Amino acid sequence: RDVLPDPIYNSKLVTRLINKIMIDGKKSKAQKILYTAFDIIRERTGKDPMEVFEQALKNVMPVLEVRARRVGGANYQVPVEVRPDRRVSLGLRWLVQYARLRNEKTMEERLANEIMDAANNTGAAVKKREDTHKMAEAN
């Protein structure tokens, strides 16, 4: 299993993200959003958006997770090391989940900001990675 590199950034990560952003099969729209988001980031951070983005990813990606693990004949909610490909998925999912919930009028604005915030280690997605590491710690 593999994905295709986005035209513009030639990035698979970007493809994986245009995926979670996708709604109703309107890919052109989910693409316009992510690229316009990436431009909002550029003009506002004056940085390469891919740089902000990986930073955000780096801060939102869980390393520990708590999952069911039937043992004996019972189910024990347990703390497990998330895997490379899972961290990226969760990260991208969390970045796109909360961004959806934000308040900017626009989803490119909403996606841009959630990514910028997360690049600065704040916002809902980073929180999600925190609670998450929280529970995995406790258990």
The CATH number assigned to the domain holding 15 equals 1.10.455.10
Note whether 23 and 90 are within 8 A (CB). no
| Joined tokens for residue 120 | 């600065």
Contact by Cβ (8 Å): 68, 75 = yes
CA distances from 130 to 60, 68, 116 (A): 8, 19, 17
CA 126 – CA 89 distance, rounded (Å): 14
Q: How far apart are CA 29 and CA 135, in angstroms?
A: 37
Residue 68 backbone zone (phi > 0: left; psi -120 to 50: alpha; other: beta): beta
- In the chain, DSSP finds a helix count (H) and a strand count (E) of 6, 4
Q: Which value, to the nearest 10 degrees, does the dihedral of the CA atoms of residues 43, 45, 46, 49 take?
A: -90
Cα 11 → chain centroid: 15
Paired with 71 in beta bridges are: 74
- Written in H, E and C, the secondary structure of 25-69 is CCHHHHHHHHHHHHHHHHHHHCCCHHHHHHHHHHHHCCCEEEECC
The amino acid that residue 36 corresponds to is: T
* Domains contained in the chain, number: 1
Experimentally determined by = X-ray
57: Cβ contacts below 8 Å, ≥ 6 apart: 13, 88, 91, 92, 95, 118
Give the integer Cα–Cα distance in Å for 137 and 128.
Answer: 14
Q: Mapping DSSP to helix (H, G, I), strand (E, B) and coil, where does residue 15 land?
A: helix
Residue-number span of the structural domain to which 41 is assigned: 1-139
Provide the 3-class DSSP secondary structure of residue 79. Answer: strand
Burial of 81 (0-12, 13-18, 19+ CB in 10 A): exposed
**Cα torsion through 61, 120, 131, 37, rounded to 10:** -60
Tokens at residue 51, please?
């740089």
